[PDB]
């Protein structure tokens, strides 16, 4: 089977429309993969200590931990940019109210392994041969024994471009640490910070081996391989954003003065307080909007920029990413700043490497702590500098840490919204944390597999031994080998169409003569895949 | 079939649990094998005489014998380290009361033969080609015509590591010797030691030939090969150790004084001798523990460090390996000192080669000769220096050879225990000595095949002749060739789970923060496979 | 309950007998008995 092709290339995007308004969005993604021969044929247990970690203030910069570096490379296509292209997104987000994960199947084919012979005859000349017989190692951890490691959050996914080759990344998992950083400091002060790390508590050591946990298929040029057909069990994802806030829930207080002159300038009048009727979660006989009965709490302040410390070290306490307020805050509203790559958007040509861009979901929930505040005992419209905590009050003596930094408003009354899909660098589905009690969602991605997540796809070039034996020695020498093999995946979703219910037209992402540039190549061949808002369709909340 | 893979890699360890508490421990072992082209295409009959052999005292150092060196290489996977890994062992030994050999099957695949062309163009450059057509010779001695030669006892097994390549060893058997060493000496003395050897008595010459006794399969890259499915007939192996000794068998003498104060310090009292009742294998009306009726003899002294001499020369008389006593003796209790290898445990990285470590089974039987003794005629509690042989008495005039060195206590009353499995360097099953009367066990391994043992797997690279003819000449010249071919074996056992019968918890092999290091790679890729106790579950004996 | 199985390479925690604790699982020369508490949930588990 040497001279015959095993699989087929296809990167089409099929949108089947069915009855009652559903759609079978079928995304085909093919891509030419390139794999280099693992440079260290062993399993290494490496630690990581950075000089920066152990300095006054630079604690947040701590990078310590332990790595299990495997000789295997991983093929993760879990990231929107893989499946869709700009146009696709525009369609889906501009018209589907919800979308959900259905089936997924990969397939590796037209494997080609290549030897490289050196010819230092005057100038270093390279000769390329085909080791027809050599093999490509492929492993599929169906049961997820190997620690899960999504690539997406490190833009180490496959190339978001069908006409451009791409590389799978080095597989390496976390191993128990015993990180020490006592005690925290502050930029200036002189103190002796202890900075250590020693492979975790023995009882917590997890040392896995591709070889030991999964059957490995050997693939010669004429061989082929294919995932079965995995079916997701996932809570559908909404592609609509809420807006209403507690100050916009329910029956608006009836007015007594409708304006008499055009312009959003002139407003209407409400009867004085006192004379108003209804419920009150406060005592004063006066019913204000800020102080009014609402169904629940839409949103919540999560102590921002708080660092917690557990065995593995210190770390930022995650915040459910929601849209910022008119006071572009971001960090407290879990905004997510992605960094691009010469392969995940960002002009292929550009001289400077990678790109910035921060992301803010559309669902309005977030807060503006630089505004929030607290008052004492019986409220009292008309504060008491003494009986009122403000967004500019010194907590614990530090003149810039205000109450909001420590304030947590989560409660049974809280109504929250899930992360947003972030085309394209965004992760798509995610394994669920195997803890007795589970999280209501993840920040990583919008889809969490209720059951068992799809399998990790592993790859590694079969060691091409020489005549200089093996064993009875440290690191064995081998023929320089590499591989070019294709890959085709099929991700299938389900979504519902939207419909005209209101009077006014809504948001929709379009082309402006000032952005087409971003969806069109360059006079040289530059291509971008700059991220786009998602969940842009307005939705009632109450 | 050039570009297609023949077999599949799998080194998983399946533990199926069935009814009534049995387990189908199925061990899959795959490994990339590397074979070099036999350097001497003939069958050589070599002798071996060491200078050390013929010197005063250094007799024990005798290495003489005769070798039949074949051009074939052997693939022996008979050794625990092949099949299981540290974790596996911990599980099996920590929970199975017994285990037994069931089925076994090998399979060679993805054969690849390679030519190596020289290019001494300035610096010696190597060019690697594929002799697609050349073949790999494989022979399976199903009926065991070729002399059996387990690799295990010479740590020449396959590599105990799935992610590391390995080499099969040179096959060479013993051939009749007529070793002469008359007469024994002692380090100092001047005497004329005759040291000779001449290929054994003609009537005892056994000259085998792979070619002449077994059909050989030729394998081209696209070929495959597989053992059938051999079934063992073996006495199950206990994974529990006995403890009770003759001084701990049966009904303990009833006491008459139970202690009144806490602490293992204060003991209880037994009525004086005389007044005691029962059997006695002695005359005195006084019944002592040392001199008390017991069911049988648990253990036995085997004349230690005794050297016997038969045709092939002198040699140490084997001792059933049992645990040492509180007087760490070892040698007299057949302890087994294994020597590791850069491929059978022992840090791959370490600068020093190989490792030490001695082994002591758990079943308590062994003795402490430096304690034993003998008394005369009617016993008599209260010796006679004259009527009492002691552990420090000069035998035959030599001031350091005491009676124990010559003492053999084996008898019909002897109750003995079988060798222990020694993970991982330990041999697993073993051929039975074809003598009219058989041994009750072997020391080599714990499993002895009642029927015919599995077949020896032979390998050798098909001679890649050149254009410089052959025959009509001594040693023929040929193209330098070698091979990389995979191998997968499937060893299946049966074992029973343990159960809580007593009150107290028992031994169990665990992780201490002081040993995980041994089950975890190194920051460079070092791996160890240090041996572990086995048979660690306590067992009643009576 | 469900049995455990060898998935990884390394052996794990396990509660055993040390010559320094058997005392706690054995009566006294007078009849003393202890039932000192022991760790539980001692088998390592992946979380992600």
Swiss-Prot record, chain C:
Signal peptide: none annotated. It is found in: Virion; Host nucleus. Coiled coil: none annotated. It comes from the Viruses. Belongs to the parvoviridae capsid protein family. Capsid protein self-assembles to form an icosahedral capsid with a T=1 symmetry, about 22 nm in diameter, and consisting of 60 copies of two size variants of the capsid proteins, VP1 and VP2, which differ by the presence of an N-terminal extension in the minor protein VP1. The capsid encapsulates the genomic ssDNA. Capsid proteins are responsible for the attachment to host cell receptors. This attachment induces virion internalization predominantly through clathrin-dependent endocytosis. VP3 might be a post-translational cleavage product of VP2 in several autonomous parvoviruses. The N-terminus of VP1 is sequestered within the mature capsid. It contains a phospholipase A2-like region and putative nuclear localization signals. This is Capsid protein VP1.
């Amino acid at each position: 089977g040497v001279g015959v092709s095993t699989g087929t290339f296809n990167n089409q995007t099929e949108f089947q429309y069915l009855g009652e308004g559903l759609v079978r969005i079928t995304a085909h993604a093919s891509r030419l993969i390139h794999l280099n021969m693992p440079e260290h044929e062993t399993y290494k247990r490496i630690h990581v200590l950075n000089s920066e970690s152990g300095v006054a203030g630079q604690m947040v910069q701590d990078d310590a931990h332990t790595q299990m570096v495997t000789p295997w490379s991983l093929i993760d296509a879990n990231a929107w940019g893989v499946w869709f292209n700009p146009a696709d997104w525009q369609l889906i987000s501009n018209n589907m109210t919800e979308i959900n994960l259905v089936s997924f199947e990969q397939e590796i084919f037209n494997v080609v392994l290549k030897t490289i012979t050196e010819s230092a005859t005057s100038p270093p000349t390279k000769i390329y041969n085909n080791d027809l017989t050599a093999s490509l190692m492929v492993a599929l951890d169906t049961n997820n024994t190997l620690p899960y490691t999504p690539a997406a959050p490190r833009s180490e996914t496959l190339g978001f471009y069908p006409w451009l080759p791409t590389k799978p990344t080095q597989y390496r998992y976390y191993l128990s640490c015993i990180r020490n950083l006592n005690p925290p400091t502050y930029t200036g002060q002189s103190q002796q910070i202890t900075d250590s790390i020693q492979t975790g508590l023995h009882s917590d050591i997890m040392f896995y081996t591709i070889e030991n946990a999964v059957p490995i298929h050997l693939l010669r040029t004429g061989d082929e391989f294919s995932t079965g057909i995995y079916h997701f069990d996932t809570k559908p994802l909404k592609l609509t954003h809420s807006w209403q806030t507690n100050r916009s829930l329910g029956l608006p207080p009836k007015l007594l003065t409708e304006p008499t002159t055009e312009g959003d300038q002139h407003p209407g009048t409400l009867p004085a307080a006192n004379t108003r009727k209804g419920y009150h979660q406060t005592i004063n006989n006066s019913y204000t909007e800020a102080t009014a009965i609402r169904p629940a709490q839409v949103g919540y302040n999560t102590p921002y920029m708080n660092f917690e410390y557990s065995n593995g070290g210190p770390f930022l306490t995650p915040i459910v990413p929601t849209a910022d307020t008119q006071y572009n805050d971001d960090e407290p509203n879990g905004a997510i700043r992605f960094t691009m790559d010469y392969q995940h958007g960002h002009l292929t040509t550009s001289s400077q490497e990678l790109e910035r861009y921060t992301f803010n979901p559309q669902s309005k929930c977030g807060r503006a702590p630089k505004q929030q505040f607290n008052q004492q005992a019986p409220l009292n419209l008309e504060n008491t500098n003494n009986g009122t905590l403000l967004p500019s009050d010194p907590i614990g003596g530090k003149s810039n840490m205000h109450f909001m930094n420590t304030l947590n408003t989560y409660g049974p009354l809280t109504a929250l919204n899930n992360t947003a899909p972030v085309f394209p660098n965004g992760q798509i589905w995610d394994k669920e944390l195997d803890t007795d009690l589970k999280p209501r969602l993840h920040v990583t991605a919008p889809f969490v597999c209720k059951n068992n997540p799809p399998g990790q796809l592993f790859v590694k070039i079969a060691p091409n031994l020489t005549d200089d034996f093996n064993a009875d020695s440290p690191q064995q020498p081998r023929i320089i080998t590499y591989s070019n093999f294709w890959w085709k995946g099929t991700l299938t979703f389900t979504a519902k169409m939207r419909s005209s219910n209101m009077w006014n037209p809504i948001q929709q992402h379009t082309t402006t003569a000032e952005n087409i540039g971003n969806y069109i190549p360059t006079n040289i061949g530059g291509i971008r895949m700059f991220p786009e808002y998602s969940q842009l369709i307005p939705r009632k909340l109450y």
